[PDB]
Structures are given as C-alpha cells and as structure tokens.
Hints:
Blueprint: E1 8-23, E2 26-41, E3 44-53, E4 56-65, E5 68-75, E6 79-84, E7 88-95, E8 98-113, E9 117-127, E10 131-140
Antiparallel strand pairs: 1-2, 1-10, 2-3, 3-4, 4-5, 5-6, 7-8, 8-9, 9-10
PDB class: structural genomics, unknown function
Keywords: structural genomics, ywiB protein, all beta protein, PSI, Protein Structure Initiative, Midwest Center for Structural Genomics, mcsg, unknown function
Assembly: monomeric
Amino acid sequence: GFQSNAMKQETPITLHVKSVIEDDGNQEVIEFRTTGFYYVKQNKVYLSYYEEHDLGKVKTIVKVSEGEVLVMRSGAVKMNQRFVTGASTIAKYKMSFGELELKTSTKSIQSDLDEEKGRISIAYDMHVGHLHNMTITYEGGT
C-alpha cells in the first residue's frame, strides 16, 4: 500500500546537481549539493531530496525509466516535469499564488545508476514560449 513498503535498497546518498544553461545570449552554470536517498521501486530507480526555493522548501523525487525521467517537485513549487527523449511535454508550474504551463523538449537522456553511485544527464530545451544540460550525480554515503 504505502509506497514506502515497496522501497528496496534504500541508501543515503550525497547529491550534486549541475546545470549549464543558455538563454538569449546569457550563459550560466548553476549547481547545488545536498543529501538524500536512492531507492528502487518496481525495478526503477528513484532519488529523493529537498531543495530550497526563494519561497521555501521543495521536495524532489526523480524517477528514472527507459527513455524518460520524471522530476516531481512539491512544496514551495509544484511541478511534475516529464523528460521524454525526442518529444515535448507540458506541465503546470504551480505556486501558492498561481500557475503557468512550461514546455519541456528533451534531446537526450543518459543514465547509469546503482546504490553506490550514479549519473543522469539530460539535454533539453524549456520555454514558456532556453537550452539546458543538467547532470545529477550522487555517491552513497553521508
């Protein structure tokens, strides 16, 4: 019943999330580090952690499948961002005071994941309508 019951190989991890972004002439590299958990449900890998937004705490669950990654944010930002290689998806970016649809066009996804270390790399374009290369890496421990 509870999703916690189906969690296998739960492992505390240290995470590093790095994005290279280009937007109408501007270039930025943004990265963050925090701790969290690696686990498996129904033979798919999940990463769970929290991140900080200006408006407060966000809970983030990353679900990795063949050819697709789902990043579920909740709390100060609510968005289920669905990365599908070679396709575009739309999702609501919702805050306490309103919402806006964002379109995600994914070019490529690479993942290599286990309970000791892993990497997910996603190249994608965003817009309200912005080139992004996001790499999530983690190591088991602390």
